[PDB]
Amino acid sequence: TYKFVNMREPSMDMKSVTDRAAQTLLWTELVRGLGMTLSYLFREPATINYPFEKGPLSPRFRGEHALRRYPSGEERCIACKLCEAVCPAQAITIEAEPRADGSRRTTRYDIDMTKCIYCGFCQEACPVDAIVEGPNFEFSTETHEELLYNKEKLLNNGDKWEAEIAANIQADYLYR
């Protein structure tokens, strides 16, 4: 199927010519352009004021990373290493040694925050969903160094943004 979009024969009667002659002379299609501008002026603006209000998001939002931990308190990060093999920017970096007890927790988990793209792949990669992307997106900075994250900063994000992502994953794991 197809549909012509431009072809059209203008009517050639005196009324039609007068219509077109009036249109060029007494600008009517021009005034129509002005006509619905006023309708836009006398309308509610959609201006969300910030930080007072917030454009809606979803329980699946991907933002600042935050390494979580078990309800007992122990780190979820198993050093399973899979997040690297999927990280398409190779932002993360995992190296682990046997702990004092023996349970391996990474001695270095440094997401280069100005490297990743917030894939959601690292979340989809973790078999114990240790690394998540917190709903926070307002974490700008002034020195390039503060962007460069580490294991401790990740853990602090997990402990700071803990209730939200625990709730978000609780309401979103069924889709996953």
């Binding site: 549909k3 431009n6 619905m36 501008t37 836009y40 699946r60 939002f61 093999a85 398409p88």
Partner: protein, 357 residues
């Protein structure tokens, strides 16, 4: 008389970086390939990859694939006309309709979790399922959308000074456009009868009714009416697809190419091993080459990826719609004023992120 540009201001690794990544890691490349229409690129790459694996997606996954593919089709034509409005001098239109783009962007956030770079279309079907109520949100927006595009229509089409600045201002004849690699809308506005949607009905496209907007002589105005008509037709493709959503699945039931469900991941070993290997090296694609193109909302978007029988691609040259359509600029601007060049670009779609392959 002569107009050859110089690009590379956004030339990037793309194909060069792709070879050192796996297919799944190569998916974000296409999302960021062009910076305007994201979802439709993953349409091409996933289609090409699933073609190499001889795995067809579940029927439902195709239906979301087309639904969001045409939602992004709605995204693309909005900016091309309104940026043409920004060029041509009409600042009001691009503010009005662009508020509507925030609604589809909100839809993108609800499904994928990212506002623009969804990374949603994956080989073997879409990654995740729609949230409960996303379909309703589409209908609420779509109900009022034609009302918004009419607001664009009234002030940006019959405006006497929009018309003259878009009529007769640059035109390409039939064989000239055909032989310049022009494709998709660019030929359709010049009168050529061709459309990837119908002639080569990729995905579930052979079950939805729509009308391609072929036009007159083929100047800036001609394709302009073609583009807005595409949005109206895209609205029906949305509407047909909105009440056709079947009770199916989102991913292929082949764990060797699709990550297993997280619930079964932490329970069954075959899921764990398959998730492990798929997330370490990924699926191995059988060797060969394939150029598969889809109708981009800008032109003909094709990826000619060649498989080395490994878990990674070998070379993934892209048919960039911006590329081939920038190739025509020299003949496209034979005999026109300097102030026309920006509008000469405007009738086309040259996103500097996409032209560079």
């Amino acid at each position: 008389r002569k107009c050859d540009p110089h690009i590379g201001l956004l030339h990037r690794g793309t194909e060069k970086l792709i070879e050192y990544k796996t297919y799944l890691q190569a998916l974000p490349y296409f999302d960021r390939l062009d910076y305007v229409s994201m979802m439709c690129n993953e349409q091409a790459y996933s289609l090409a990859v699933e073609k190499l694996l001889n795995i067809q997606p579940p029927p439902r996954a195709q239906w979301i694939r087309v639904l969001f593919g045409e939602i992004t089709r709605l995204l693309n034509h909005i900016m091309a006309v309104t940026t043409h409005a920004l060029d041509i001098g009409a600042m009001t239109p691009f503010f009005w309709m662009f508020e509507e783009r925030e609604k589809m962007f909100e839809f993108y956030e609800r499904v994928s979790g990212a506002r623009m770079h969804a990374a949603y279309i994956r080989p073997g079907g879409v990654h995740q399922d729609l949230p409960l109520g996303l379909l309703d949100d589409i209908y609420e927006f779509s109900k009022n959308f034609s009302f918004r595009i009419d607001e664009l229509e009234e002030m940006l089409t019959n405006n006497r000074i929009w018309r003259n600045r878009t009529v007769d201002i640059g035109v390409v004849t039939a064989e000239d456009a055909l032989n310049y690699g022009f494709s998709g809308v660019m030929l359709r506005g010049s009168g050529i009868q061709w459309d990837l949607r119908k002639t080569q009905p990729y995905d579930v496209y052979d079950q939805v009714e729509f009308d391609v907007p072929i036009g007159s002589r083929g100047d800036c105005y001609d394709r302009y009416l073609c583009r807005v008509e595409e949005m109206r037709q895209s609205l029906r493709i949305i509407s047909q697809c909105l009440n056709k959503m079947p009770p199916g699945e989102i991913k292929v039931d082949d764990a060797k190419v699709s990550p297993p469900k997280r619930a079964e991941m932490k329970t069954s070993m075959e899921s764990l091993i398959h998730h492990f290997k798929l997330y370490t090296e990924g699926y191995q694609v059988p060797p060969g080459a394939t150029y598969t193109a889809i109708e981009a909302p800008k032109g003909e978007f094709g990826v000619y990826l060649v498989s080395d029988g490994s878990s990674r691609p070998y070379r993934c040259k892209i048919k960039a719609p911006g590329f081939a359509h920038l190739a025509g600029l020299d003949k496209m601007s034979k005999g026109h004023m300097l102030a026309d060049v920006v509008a000469i670009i405007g009738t086309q779609d040259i996103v500097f992120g996409e032209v560079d392959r």
